[PDB]
Amino acid sequence: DQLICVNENGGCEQYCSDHTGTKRSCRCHEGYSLLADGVSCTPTVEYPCGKIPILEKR
Amino acid sequence: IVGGKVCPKGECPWQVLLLVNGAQLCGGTLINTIWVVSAAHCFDKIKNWRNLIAVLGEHDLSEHDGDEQSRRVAQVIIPSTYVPGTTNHDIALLRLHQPVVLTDHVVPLCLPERTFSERTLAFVRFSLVSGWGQLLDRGATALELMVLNVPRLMTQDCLQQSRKVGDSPNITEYMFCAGYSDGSKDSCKGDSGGPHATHYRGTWYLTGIVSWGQGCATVGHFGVYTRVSQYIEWLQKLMRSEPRPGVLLRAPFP
Ligand SMILES: Cc1cc2ccc1[C@@H](C)COC(=O)Nc1ccc(C3(C(=O)O)CCCCC3)c(c1)CN(C)C(=O)[C@@H]2Nc1ccc2c(N)ncc(F)c2c1
Ligand SMILES: [Ca+2]
C-alpha cells in the first residue's frame, strides 16, 4: 500500500485522500468542484470560501 | 494590531466584529454563512448572552456604508477542556441565528481539513492576522480594520527565541507562536478571536485564532495563536448538531 498524500499533498490544490494501492483522490472544499486534471479546484458558486472578490475581479 | 496597515476594504471579507450591547468585544472569522470561529476567552466576562451580535462586512467603525451585515448570535460553543482565565483550548464556535448573505464584502474563510492543515498549511511561513484591536500597547484601538503579515514558528524555536520569564504559560500542542520578538509587530488583546489566515495555491484558510501573549508587541515575546487544526473534527461535528436552549454551550473535547 503506497502513501501518496504525504508527498506535496498528492499534487492536490486542496484536499488529498489515499486509497488502496497507488490510488489517490483529490477533493475540494464545499463551493468548489474538482477539474478533469484530478488536482485543481474551481468555484461552483459566486462567493467560494478563501477567495477575495475585489482581487478576483481585478 | 501593532505595526500592520489598514486592510483595504473588502480584502479581509471573512473578518467578523463581535459586539455586546453594541460595544466592541472581540474579532471572529466567518467560515460559512451561519458559523463563526472566535476565541473562548472572549466570553469569560459576558453576562448579556442575548445581546451578542456578529457584524460581517465591517471595515470603518465610524461610518455605516451599507456593506455591513449584523446577526444575532444563537450559540457560543466552547470546548469542555477550556478553563476561563487560562490559555489552553482557546476556541469558540458561534452559530448565527440566520445566515449572512455572501457579497463582495462578506465571504467565509475556508476551514481546512486537518491533515491538509497539519502537513501543508502548517509549513506556509507567513499568514495574515487582522482586527480592530490596539494600534499600540496600552493605546487606542483601531477605527479601521488592520492587517499584519506574521511568520509562524515551530514551538521549539518559539521557546528558545523568547525571553526567560517566570510564571508564564506553556505553548501547548493546541497553540502555535507567530510574529516577531523585536516588539515591532503583533496582534493585540482587542484582536482576540480574529483570524490567522494562510494562503495556499490561490485560496485562504483558517489556521489560527488570535489568542494570547505577554503584552502587545513586547520585546522577547511572540503572539500565541490557537492551533485550529486540532479542532477541525470537533468543529465539523458541532456544525452538524442541532442548537440547544441557552446561548452558551460547553461541548466535550475531543
Ligand atoms: C487568554 C489570554 C488573553 C490575553 C492575555 C493573556 C491571556 C492568558 C495568559 C490569561 O487569561 C486571560 O487573561 N484571560 C482573558 C479573558 C478575557 C479577556 C477579555 C478582556 O478583559 O478584555 C474579556 C472581555 C472581552 C475581551 C477579552 C482578556 C483576557 C483580555 N486580554 C488581556 C486578552 O484578551 C489577551 N489577549 C491577547 C491576544 C493576543 C496577544 C498577542 N498576539 N500578543 C501579545 C498579547 F499580549 C496578546 C494578548
Ligand atoms: Ca462601517
Side-chain angles (χ1 to χ4, degrees), chain A residues 1 4-58, chain B residues 1-163 166-254:
Chain A
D1 186 51
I4 306 183
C5 302
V6 286
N7 286 325
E8 293 178 299
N9 198 41
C12 311
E13 173 170 335
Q14 293 181 6
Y15 311 146
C16 187
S17 289
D18 285 298
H19 293 298
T20 302
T22 40
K23 305 177 190 77
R24 180 267 278 143
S25 285
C26 294
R27 292 172 294 99
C28 308
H29 190 276
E30 181 179 302
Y32 289 89
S33 60
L34 188 70
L35 291 186
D37 63 16
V39 289
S40 299
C41 295
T42 190
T44 60
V45 301
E46 51 177 4
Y47 296 109
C49 68
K51 291 202 189 287
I52 301 164
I54 63 150
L55 299 181
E56 286 298 313
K57 297 164 200 212
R58 207 180 287 276
Chain B
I1 300 291
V2 167
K5 62 172 190 75
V6 172
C7 176
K9 176 181 160 69
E11 286 187 26
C12 295
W14 32 79
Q15 176 77 51
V16 177
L17 174 59
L18 298 173
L19 300 186
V20 57
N21 299 129
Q24 184 173 334
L25 182 76
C26 266
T29 300
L30 191 74
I31 58 163
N32 54 59
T33 58
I34 76 124
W35 295 97
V36 166
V37 173
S38 189
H41 82 264
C42 290
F43 309 93
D44 273 16
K45 290 181 73 162
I46 305 264
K47 314 283 170 89
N48 295 348
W49 293 96
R50 269 85 182 150
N51 307 150
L52 178 63
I53 299 291
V55 185
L56 264 304
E58 184 58 280
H59 171 66
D60 188 327
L61 304 187
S62 73
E63 186 199 49
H64 178 83
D65 65 11
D67 291 333
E68 308 86 348
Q69 293 184 45
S70 289
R71 286 303 186 271
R72 296 194 326 274
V73 178
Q75 197 112 88
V76 176
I77 311 165
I78 289 169
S80 62
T81 50
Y82 171 71
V83 176
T86 72
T87 54
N88 220 12
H89 305 289
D90 193 14
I91 179 163
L93 177 62
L94 279 63
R95 188 192 299 259
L96 306 180
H97 271 284
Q98 293 305 322
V100 288
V101 168
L102 304 184
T103 64
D104 280 4
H105 292 94
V106 174
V107 177
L109 187 56
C110 307
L111 178 76
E113 284 194 352
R114 181 207 277 263
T115 299
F116 173 63
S117 191
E118 287 170 344
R119 292 187 183 156
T120 301
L121 303 179
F123 303 101
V124 174
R125 194 173 172 225
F126 286 92
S127 293
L128 306 178
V129 296
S130 49
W132 291 271
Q134 290 80 11
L135 287 172
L136 295 177
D137 190 27
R138 296 178 282 168
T141 56
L143 289 177
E144 281 191 286
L145 184 52
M146 305 302 279
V147 66
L148 173 70
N149 198 29
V150 289
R152 186 165 171 170
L153 283 83
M154 295 284 225
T155 294
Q156 190 169 263
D157 298 353
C158 179
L159 294 161
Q160 61 183 289
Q161 279 171 246
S162 302
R163 248 160 176 83
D167 198 69
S168 62
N170 290 318
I171 293 93
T172 80
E173 288 279 69
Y174 300 99
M175 293 170 201
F176 67 83
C177 296
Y180 303 87
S181 60
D182 73 345
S184 61
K185 291 172 228 65
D186 202 0
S187 53
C188 291
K189 64 175 188 178
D191 300 305
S192 289
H196 171 280
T198 306
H199 195 245
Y200 184 72
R201 291 195 62 189
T203 300
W204 288 91
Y205 296 89
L206 182 65
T207 48
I209 298 162
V210 179
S211 183
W212 64 278
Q214 312 271 275
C216 205
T218 299
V219 180
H221 307 296
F222 291 91
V224 190
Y225 297 82
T226 303
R227 193 179 292 243
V228 171
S229 59
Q230 299 275 39
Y231 302 88
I232 303 309
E233 297 96 343
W234 180 81
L235 291 164
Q236 289 296 350
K237 178 166 187 276
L238 288 160
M239 296 193 276
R240 277 179 269 130
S241 74
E242 280 298 336
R244 307 184 186 268
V247 179
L248 177 67
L249 179 65
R250 287 182 72 243
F253 181 82

